[PDB]
Amino acid sequence: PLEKALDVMVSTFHKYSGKEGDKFKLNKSELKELLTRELPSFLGKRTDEAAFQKLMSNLDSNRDNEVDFQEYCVFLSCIAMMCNEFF
Amino acid sequence: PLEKALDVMVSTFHKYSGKEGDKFKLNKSELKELLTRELPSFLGKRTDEAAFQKLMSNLDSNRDNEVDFQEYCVFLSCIAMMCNEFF
Ligand SMILES: [Ca+2]
Ligand SMILES: [Ca+2]
Ligand SMILES: [Ca+2]
Ligand SMILES: [Ca+2]
CATH of the domain at B7: 1.10.238.10
One-letter amino acid for residue A43 of the chain: L
Considering every ligand atom, which ligand is closest to the CA of A72? 2
Distance CA B38, CA B32 (A): 10
A49-78: b (≥16 Cβ within 10 Å) or e: eeebeebbeebbeeeeebbbbebbbebbbe
Chain-chain contact of A80 with B73 (C-beta, under 8 angstroms): yes
Do A66 and A26 form a contact (C-beta atoms < 8 A)?
A: yes
Question: Which chain A residues are within 8 Å of B41, Cβ to Cβ?
Answer: 3
Q: Does A7 touch chain B (CB under 8 A)?
A: yes
Chain-chain contact of B38 with A81 (C-beta, under 8 angstroms): no
Distance CA B52, CA A50 (A): 47
Q: Does B4 touch chain A (CB under 8 A)?
A: yes
Distance CA B86, CA A82 (A): 29
Q: Can you tell me whether residue A67 is helix, strand or coil?
A: strand
One-letter amino acid for residue A48 of the chain: D
One-letter amino acid for residue B9 of the chain: M
Distance CA B3, CA A60 (A): 21
Strand duo B25-26 + B67-68: pairing: antiparallel
Residue B40, judged by CB atoms within 10 A of its CB (0-12, 13-18, 19+), counts as exposed
Residue A80, judged by CB atoms within 10 A of its CB (0-12, 13-18, 19+), counts as buried
One-letter amino acid for residue A82 of the chain: M
Question: Which chain A residues are within 8 Å of B6, Cβ to Cβ?
Answer: 5, 76, 79-80, 83
Chain-chain contact of B5 with A3 (C-beta, under 8 angstroms): no
Q: Can you tell me whether residue A25 is helix, strand or coil?
A: strand
The kind and range of the H/E element at A13 are: helix A2-17
Nearest Cα to Cα of residue B13 among B3, B79, A75, B27: B27
Report the domain count for chain A: 1
Radius of gyration for chain B, computed over Cα atoms and rounded to the nearest angstrom: 13
Distance CA A67, CA A28 (A): 9
Q: Can you tell me whether residue A26 is helix, strand or coil?
A: strand
Distance CA A34, CA A72 (A): 11
> Is B7 known to sit in a ligand binding site?
no
Q: Which residue segment(s) compose the domain that A34 sits in? A: 1-87
Chain-chain contact of A6 with B70 (C-beta, under 8 angstroms): no
Resolution as reported, in Å: 2.0
What was the structure determination method?
A: X-ray
Q: Which of A77, A81, A85, A87 is the best residue to mutate to test the B interface, defined by the most B CB atoms within 10 Å of its own CB? A: A77
